[model samples]
Structure formats: C-alpha cells, structure tokens
Target chain A: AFELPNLPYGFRALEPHIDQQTMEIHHDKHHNTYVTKLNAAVEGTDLESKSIEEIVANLDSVPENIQTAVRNNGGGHLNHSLFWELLTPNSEEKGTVVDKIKEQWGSLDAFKEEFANQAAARFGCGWAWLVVNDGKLEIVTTPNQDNPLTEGKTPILGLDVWEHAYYLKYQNKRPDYISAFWNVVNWEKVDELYNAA
Target chain B: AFELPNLPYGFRALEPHIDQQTMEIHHDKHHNTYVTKLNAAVEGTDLESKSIEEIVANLDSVPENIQTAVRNNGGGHLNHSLFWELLTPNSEEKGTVVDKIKEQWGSLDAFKEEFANQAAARFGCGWAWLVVNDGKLEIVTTPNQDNPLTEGKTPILGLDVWEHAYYLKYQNKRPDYISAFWNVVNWEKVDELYNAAK
Candidate 1:
C-alpha cells in the first residue's frame, strides 16, 4: 500500500532550498530503492500479509530471524510513508502545531534553534523529531532506521537528517538546511497529528 | 603544515558491515562539523595568503581570513598533510599491488573494481579515490576535502569518501570504504609507489 507521493510542483520546485537534481535523485532513485529493497526483504516472510501499522505495532513479535529486515525494511516503509505526509508545496505555515511550539518553546525562533541543535547534535545519519510523548511535546533523535513510533512516541514533526536527505543541497551545513526547513513544514498536518492524539 | 585526514575507515566499520553508532557520530559530529567552521570561507581578497598551496609552498600563507583559515585547518592543512600519508598504515599492501591480484582489468582487477565503483557509487557526503598517480600508477577516488598536492596527482594512496572517512567505523555501507582500501593493503612498507607507477 506504500506508494510514492507526488510533489505538488515540478521536480525543481523546491529550488534554492533543495535543488531539483537532489530532489529527483532523492525521490526517484533513493526512495524508490528503499521501496524495492523493502519489498524484497519481506518476500516469503510471515509478516508479508500484515498491514504496515500491524507490522510496526508488533515489531517485537516478528520472528527474530527476520528482525533486522523488519527493522530496516519495515522501518523504511513506515518512515517514508510518514515522511511523504510531512512535506507540502502549499505555503501553509502556522497551525495548531505552531501554537504549541510557542507555548512549549517560547517562540518559533526558539523552537527552531532547539530543533537545529537537535538535528546538528544527533551525531549521525538519522532523524530529529518534534514528538508528542504521552501528551507532552518533546524533541528526540533516532539513529539509522530507528523511529519514534517504535519507541511509542507519536511523531508530530520530523526532519530527515541523513546526508542523503540534505547533503546535495546543504552539504557540510546541515544546520542551515534545518533552519530553512521552517519555511516548508506542514504545520497543519502536524497539528492534526497532535490533535488526534 | 599538518592536516587531519577526514578519516580512513568506511562510514561503517567491521560489524554488521560496520556498526551504525560509529558511522553516524563519526560523520555527523567529526567530519561535517570540521568543514562547517573550518576558518570561514575565503572570499574576494589577496589570494596570496589564502590559497592552501601557497601556504604549504611557503609555510607563511595562512591568515586571519575565515575561509582561508578553514580551508587550511579543515582541508588544506588537515587534508593535504594527513592525506599525503593516509594509507601509510597499509604500507605492507604496496609490495603486492601487482603480485597479489591477477591484474584482470589491465591494472589490478580487485583494486580497480574497488576504486572505480566506490567512486562512482558513493551515496552522499563523502569521496572515492585512487591515490598514487605519481609515475604510471593511477589511483582515483573522490576525497571529501582537497586531495593530496591540490596541484598534481601523486604522493599517497587513499579515498576520502567523506562521512568522516568511515563514519564511526562504516555507517551507510560506503562501498568505496570496503572496496579496495588499506584493509587488504600494506605492502611490507614496500614504497612501491614508484614501481607501480612504472
């Protein structure tokens, strides 16, 4: 059921912030590669017929023999699906989530600083998240293939911190890209996630 | 005068193809951070005191310029110097450069496959290299920072495939890291760089 999400604008739409070429490769090649591999990883496994959420929820139940595959490929499927939902070409910025940022971190600017630090301080190829843990909003980072959902935290927002995520556009300056992400966050969608939880 | 090579190990090391912990921190905290603040970024100004070559050539070229300082500290000083001898640890591999492998691809098949593919296939934030282009031996792979000499194509043997040269040990499976590296090298301190070139 996991399918590629279409960008609202052309491949080059997120130019300057994310170059067209990088987007094309990241989406067409990289994300697709993850999907192809994940499919292969699940073939003939007992977890094959399970819904994506079912697979994620009972990750511990998946046989130990295929734990790595479920962790890696299952995670890949779950993560990219959520990652696609996080992006939006529409310039909708402030939403219920923005209001929460102000309440929790004083101001959006402060929220950004903390977020940038979280992204920069994470120390590897992974993700920095604005997650809602049991009704309390917080920040957390997960290393390769690890996700907040696995830890039982509901993800409010996340920024992909892999070099493959922002390297072509940001290169050595991930902090700068993390900063620029503020302009594109789909706060409305995040607000729904927060409110629903 | 002295520069720290990004690192010589793959993003992941030897476990599970190299543990993620080592690869992640190594590249994020260690390597990228170095480039981020390495001096600043040399802009329009007197080119003399900024270029790394001039500094290496004269030893008095570093200045207060942000970019110049960074290029020197991050790449120039750290990259060039450390890189000149990156594979020095694997000197024993040098002696058998020709003898160990059957030289299937006109050059050493194993080495060529490792270098060429790694260079061509590195995913992100790193380099692939085929160092030692001194006489006739041609090593090619991209390095994160500037390569050795910055002017010519000889001196050492390495691939800077970024992510801090190995991440903490090999995070993302930098093929270049595993392909033809100092691991299977070290030619008895052979210094065959000259003979291989011939």
Candidate 2:
C-alpha cells in the first residue's frame, strides 16, 4: 500500500506565505484522504505490486471499475509527490533551467507572468503545470487531480489551484497565493527534475 | 441589466452559525461577480431583456457563444437569489410541505439526513437541491451553478456545496457547516416556493 510521505521540514517551513495550519490540513487531511482511498482501491489488486508512477502512466492497463478511482487518487499521489518536491522555504536563482526559461520567454518575469495567468484562469479545482513536452516547455492547466503524465508530459513545476490548496490562507484571492508562491519556489529542485527528465 | 439582489436580513442575521464576514463576501463579493459577468455577457444582447430564470431555464435559446456565460452567471444569480430567500435568523416548523417531507421519509430527520448526504457528496463546487420533480419531492445534486429549472424541476430549497460557501467558517469540515445550516432554515419561504411551483 502507498503511504503518505512526511515533509522534509516542519509544517511552518514555508511560514508567512503558506500558513502552518493550512499546510497541516492540506497534507495530513486532504492529501491523506487521497492516499487512504487509493490504498483501498488497489488493496488486493495487481496494482498493489506496481509503482505509483507505472500504475498512473499505464492507466489503460488498469481495470475499468477501479480506473476512475486510480485516475483520481493515483494521480493525486504522483502529483502531490512532485508538488512536494517543487517547494522550498528558501528560494534562490541558480539553475540551467532558468537560462532555458529566459531563452524561451525572453525573461523569467515574463515566464512567471504567463504561469500566473494560466493558474488564475483555471475555472475550477485543478493544477497549473509547467511541463516538458517533446523537448519543449509548455504551460497548461488540468482539472481536478489529473497528472501531467496523463498527457505524455513531465511536469517540472506545478501550482495547485484547487480551493482547498489555498482557501484558508487566500480565500477567493487565488492570485494572491500565486504571487506569494514565488517566494518559496524550489528552483534547485526544478533544475534537478529538469536534468533528470 | 442584472443587479445583485439585497438580502432582506443583514449579514449577521444568521450569526453564530453562518458568520458575518462570510455573508458579506458571499453576497457582495462572490455573488456580485456573477451579476457583473452576467450583465457583461448579455449587454446589448437579447438576453438582457429576459429574466435570469428565463435565461437559465432556457439556455438553448441563448446565442451559442454566450450560452455558457448565461448558464454559469445566470445560474449563479438565480441560485444565490433563492439561497438568500431560504435562510432566516429564527427557524420554525409550520407548513404543508413539512407534512409532505415527513410522509416521504417517515420523519423530518430522515429527510434532512438524505439532504445532508446529497449535499456532502457533491464532490466539488455545486449545490444540493430539494426539488419538486414530476409532482414528487426529490433530493438531487448539481455541479457548478447549474439551475434546477434546466432539468424542468422547481427547487424548494438548496445548500451550496462550493468550497467558498463554507471554507471561511467550517474549512474542510463541511458536515459541521451542513449541521449548522439547519439553525437558519427559512421553512416559511420554502413552503411558499413549494406552493408557488407549477
């Protein structure tokens, strides 16, 4: 059975931006439910033997009855796992990815502006993703718990636009949370993921 | 030109349960955006001439491009209007509808339990509705501001399941918000709406 991963740092690690209580409930409560339900869906199946990434990537191989559950909860596990890797309390700019971003969009500010726009324009519960697609970088929004892997892309960064992601801290003002998120951007992690991809 | 309807009672009217700040933004800010966008969608178009209920109930008659706009914002407008009419600071039990509810479910508690289940089970942004469907009472759920009239039913009551509806007061504990909602039930208005339904 898949397990909830503990954060490398304390809940208050990204304080002043993402509040301690928000992080606590979001991870332990919201993300915990995704993990718990996913375990139930795959408990006695062949899926229990496969890695989370393999199961999600080959969803067609999964049975139809548990397909929706796997898509939602399995995708939840993979997406949140990556989302966790892409955050840092301390942000600094020293990455080959930064140069690639500047070359693609003229400047990092422009790239971020476009990223923020995509994040805000997501009408309902979803995630805004920066993915590497066919050796190109693209920004896209996916509804609910859909992972970038579903579309054959590898996401290097993501901003969860779901209300539960920021409702306590930002309420209806999601743009504000997107703005605050830059302060905690784990650029080094993004670069590592990019190199791995 | 659609406008945001004023709540008959002040924001604090449902105090100790719904909260003041929640109502202030729910009406003035959230509901206000719906009215504003609906107006922009229908401005200088034929949709502006029709009532919000008419526009939402007959979405197929709307222009293709603006149909989604009218459905979302128009549904938002009508749903919120009725939602406001269904809340009262002081709740009482007196109506033929109450009798009907009891007959349908064996007791008011059973009816409310079903209503709460439908409300909580609405996975994301949406509403839990008690509607007069084919002359029978039914509990149903609709996602993201869809009006009951679209399905040829008359809604007697609704509980918004959108996160914005309860995130301020209840956070992730939606059941607590659902439990507190009973304290502000305006049964009189529900009965009125039920009787008025054709």
Candidate 3:
C-alpha cells in the first residue's frame, strides 16, 4: 500500500513564498487523499505490488476498470511526492541544470520566463515540467495529474499549478504564484535529478 | 461583444456560506476573464452576433481555431451567469421545482442527495447540473467550463465544484460547501427554468 511521505522541512519552512496552511492542507488533505486512493485502487490486484512508476509508465497493461483510478491517483502520488522534494528552504550551488539552462536557453531569467509561461498558460488543473526530453531540457505541461514519465520523458522539475496549490495565497492570479515558486525551488535537488537522468 | 454580468445580489449576499472574497473573485476576476476571452474569440466572426446558447449548443459551427476558446470561456460566461442568479438571500416558496422533485425522486431530500453526490463526485474543476434531459430532471457533471447545452440539455440548476468556487471558505472540505449551497438556492429561479425547458 502507498503511504504519504513526511515533508523534508517543517511545514512552515517555505513561508512567505508558500504559506504554512497551504503546505499543511496540500499535504495532509490533498496529497494524502491521492495516496489513500492509489492504495485502494491496486489493493487485491496483481498491480498492488508493482511500483507506482511501473503502473503509471505502463498504464496500458492495467485493467480498464482501475485505469483511471491508477492514472489519476498514481500520477497524483508520484507528482506530489516529487513536488515535495523539488521545494526547499535551503540554497543551491548553481550546478549542472543551471549550466544546461544557460547553454540551451541563453540565460537563467530566459529559462524562467519560458517555464513560467508554460505554467501560467495551463487552462486547468495540472503541472508544468522541466524534463529531459530526448537528451535536451524541454518545458511541458500536462493536464490533471499526468506524469511526464508516461511519455518516456525524465522530469527534472515540476511546478504544480492546481488551484489548490496557490488559491489560499494567490486567488485567480496564477502568474503571481508562478513567480513565487522560484524562491523556494530546490535547484540542488533538481541538479541531482538531472544528473541521474 | 460579450460583457460580464453584474451579480444580482451584493458580493456579501451569500455570506458565511460562500464568502464575500470568493464571490467577488469568482465574479470579477474569473467570470470577467471568460467574458473577455469569449468576446475576443468571436470578435471578427459571425459568432459575435449569436446568443451565448447558440454558440455553446452549436459548437460544431464555430471556427476550429476558436472552438476551444468558445467552449471554455463561453461556457464559463454562461455557467457563472446562471450560478449567480440561482443563489439568493431572499425567501422562496416550496414551489413547482420542489413539487416536481417530490413527484420524480420520492422526496426533495432524495433529489438533494443525488444532486450533491454528483457535485461531490466531480474529480476536478467543473459543475454539477440539474438539467431537463429528454423531458425529465437528471443530474449531470461537466469537466472544466463545459455547459450541458452543448449536448442539447437544458440546465435548470448548477453547482460549481471548481476549487475556486469555495476554496477560500471551505478549503479541501468540498462537501461542506455542497451542504452550504442548499441554504442559498433560489427555487423561484429554478422553477422558472424548469418551466421554460418543458
């Protein structure tokens, strides 16, 4: 059964950028529901023992009845789990990913402009990702708990644009939330994910 | 060109159940954007002269370039327009819609239970509707700003389950917002819609 992971830093650690209450509810209420639903989706099935990524990346093999449950909840589980690690109060050393961004996109601010543009343009609940697509960094958006891994891309960073993520602090002003996201992003962790990919 | 409609009641009219802030933003920021975008979508086209229902119900006729913009923003405009009127601080009689609920669904409580269930069961941003489907009342749900009129159904009542609708007052407790909705529904308006649909 899938279990909710604890936040690496205190709930309040991302304060001012992301509020404490938003973090608490986003984790306990929203993400926890996904974990619980994901567990219930696979229980008593052969897929129960399979890893979340395996189920998500190979969704065609899952039974049709449980397919949506797995796609949504499993994607929710994986996305939120990684979303937690991608945020931190700690600073980064401007490592490999930044170097890659500067090389590919001209400069860091330009990369941010492109990334935030993708995040802001999502019409509904979803995430914007910086993923390694065919050996190069690319910006992509997926609707409603979809993981980039399903398309064979390796996600190095994701920004959740679901209203639940930022409505408490920035209502109807999604661009504001996109801007605030940069302050707490764990670029050091992103560099590691990039390296591993 | 499409215009944003004013809320019939004050922003605070639905207060405590739906917060003033939620109402204000839901109307001014959200609904206004839809009207603005919808106008932009149809501005130079023949669609500019058509009714919102005409555009929504006959989406096949809208240019492919603007179909999505019309579907989402036009539906947003229509849904929020009706949603505002469906709520009231004033009193209503048990009335025609309530009597129909009793006749069709056993009791008004049963109708509410089914309606609220549809609203709660919606997984993401969307609305729950009580529509006149094939000459009878039926509950339906639509994803993102989709209007039932697109499917040739006449919606008599709607409940927005989009997190933006109740997130300020209710947060992740969506059921609480669904429960609170009962206190503000204007049966008078719904009865009128039911009559028109029939």
Candidate 4:
C-alpha cells in the first residue's frame, strides 16, 4: 500500500529557508492526500504489486481507467519523496554534484541562475528538475505532478514551483522563494542520487 | 490604451472574508501586470481603440502574433476587473439574482454547492463562473485565465481558482476558500449583470 514517507528531518529543520508551516502542510496534508489516493488507485489491481518507481516508469502500461489517478497521485508520491530528501537544515558548500554542475555550466553561480530561470519560467504549478541524461546534467520543468521519470529522464535534484510551495511566504515573489532554496539544498543527497543514477 | 482600474472600495474593505494582504498583492502586482502587458500587446495596433469587451469579443480577428497574449492578459484584465467589483463587505441575503438562482437550481444553496464543486474540481489553475446563457444561469469553469466572454456567455459572477487567489490563507483547502467567497459575494453586482444580459 502506498504510504506517506516521513520526512528525514523534523518539520522545522529547514526553517528560515523553508518555513515550518509550509513544510508541515505540504507534507502532512498535500503529500498525505496523494498517498491516500494512490493507494486507492492501485488497490486490488495487478499494478499494486509494482513499486512507485516501476509504476511511474511504466505509466503507458497502466489501465486507462486509472491512468490519470496513477500519474497524478503516484507522481506526487515519488516527487515529494525525493523533494523531502533533497533538502536539509545543515548544508555544505561543495560536492561531486556541485563539481558536475560547474563542469556543465562553467560555475556554480551560472548553474543556479539557469536553474532559477527555469523554475521561474514555469507558467503554472509544476516542478523544476536538475536531471542527468546520457551522463550530461540538464535543467527541465514539468507541469502539475509530473516528474522527469514520466518522460524517461532521471532526476538528480528538483524544486517544486507550485504556488502552495511558497505563496504563504513569498506571495507573488516567486524569485525570492527560488533564491531561498539555495540556502538549504542538500548537495550530499543530490550527489548520492547522481551516483545511483 | 489600457489602464489598471482602481478597486471600488478600499483594499481592506472586504477584509476578514478576503484578507487585506491578499488584496494588496493580487491587485497591485498580479492584476496590474496583466493591464501593463495587455497595453503592450495592443499598442499602435488597430485593437488599441477597442474596449476590453470588444477586443475579447473579436479575439478571432486579432493578429496571430499577439492572439495568445491578448487572450491571456486581456482575459486576466477583464476577469479581475469583474472579480474586484463582485465582492462587498456588506452583503444582502436575497435579491433578483437569488430568485433566478432558485428558479434554475431549486434553491440558492443548491446552486452554491454546485458552484463550489466546480471550483473544487478544477485541477490546476482557472475560474468558476455563474454565467447567463440563453436567459438562464449556468455554472461553468475555464482553465488558465479564460472567462465566459471567450465562449459567448455573460458572466454574472466569477471566482478565481488560481492558487495565487487563496494559497496564502487557505493553502490547499480550496473548499474553504470557495466557502468564504459566498460570504463576501455582492449579489447586487450579479443582479446588475443579469439585467444587462437580459
């Protein structure tokens, strides 16, 4: 059965960078609802046997009746799972991920600028991903509960651009939320994902 | 040329139902941006002389280059204009709009329930509208800044379902936001639109 994964750190761990209240509601309310619905979508179906990763990767094979539910709720399950891990209260300066980003975009600042631009340019609710494709790092975005996996790409890092992510704190200033994201990034977790991919 | 219209009441006038901070940002930042870009999209073009209603009505004739911009920003401009006017700090219980709603849906509460369901069912960003079509009021929704005017209907009332509308106060509880909208509804404004349509 699909279940909401507990955040590795306390809800207040990323405070000042990402606020306590946003984390609480984003996890307990939003993420939990997706898990509840995803469990319902898979229940009593042959698809129930597969993992979330497999379910997301083989979206084309899912029955049409439950396809959208699986995509939206299942994608929410996986994306938020990774998103929780991709953040931290204590962040370090550099890592293999940082080195790779520098190699791809010439410097850390340049990579951040490009990532922030991609995140800001998303017209509606969505996510910005730092993905690894063919051993190359690239930035991409997906609208409304979609992640790179749905499109055959592997995400090493991601940021939710959904209004619920920052509207409480940033209001209409999405750029400010994107800027704050850099402060609490867990590069170690991103590097681990990169190595696994 | 286009200009951002001022709110008929003070920014805080509808407060406690819709918060003052949301009003300030929604009007000053979001709505103002739409007006600014709409002017840029039609400036020096023949469309400059047309009213927003006329521009929206003739979206088919707009140049292919700026069609989407006008549809989105122009719709944004018009929808928010009506949205601001459709609210009130002091609301009346019953009116001509209420009578018409009862005639169509059996009761005003039934109409509100259906309207709230439509607002809640909207997946991402859009609006829920109580529109007048063929001398009857019907509930409909449009995605991403579209309005009834785009589909040849007259909007008697509209509620923005965009996350920016309530994410700060309601935060994923869209049903709560929809509920609050009823409390601040200006039925007099709706009655006026209904009369104009007839």
Query: Which prediction has the highest TM-score against the true structure?
Result: 3
For each candidate, what TM-score against the reference?
0.60, 0.95, 0.98, 0.94
lDDT: which is higher, 3 or 4?
3
Considering summed lDDT, which 10 consecutive residues are worst modelled in model 2 chain A?
A85-94
CA error at residue B27 for candidate 3, angstroms: 0.6
Shift of residue B151 alpha carbon in model 2, Å = 1.9
Rank order by lDDT, top first? Answer: 3, 4, 2, 1
Q: Supply the TM-score for candidate 4.
A: 0.94
Error of 4 at B183 (Å): 1.3
DockQ of 4: 0.74
Number of the candidate with higher DockQ, 1 or 2: 2
Which candidate would rank higher by TM-score, 1 or 2? 2
Give the candidates in order of TM-score, highest first: 3, 2, 4, 1
Where does candidate 3 stray beyond 4 Å? B91-93
Q: Is candidate 1 or candidate 4 better by DockQ?
A: 4
> Best candidate per DockQ, number?
3
Please compute DockQ, using alpha carbons, for every candidate against the native two-chain complex.
0.02, 0.63, 0.87, 0.74
lDDT of 2 at B48: 86
Residues A1-197, candidate 1: write the lDDT tens digits: 34566655577666566667766766776666666766776787766677775777677877787777677666666766666567666647688888878999899888888889888876546788888888889988876656777778888788878776676555556888887777667777798779876
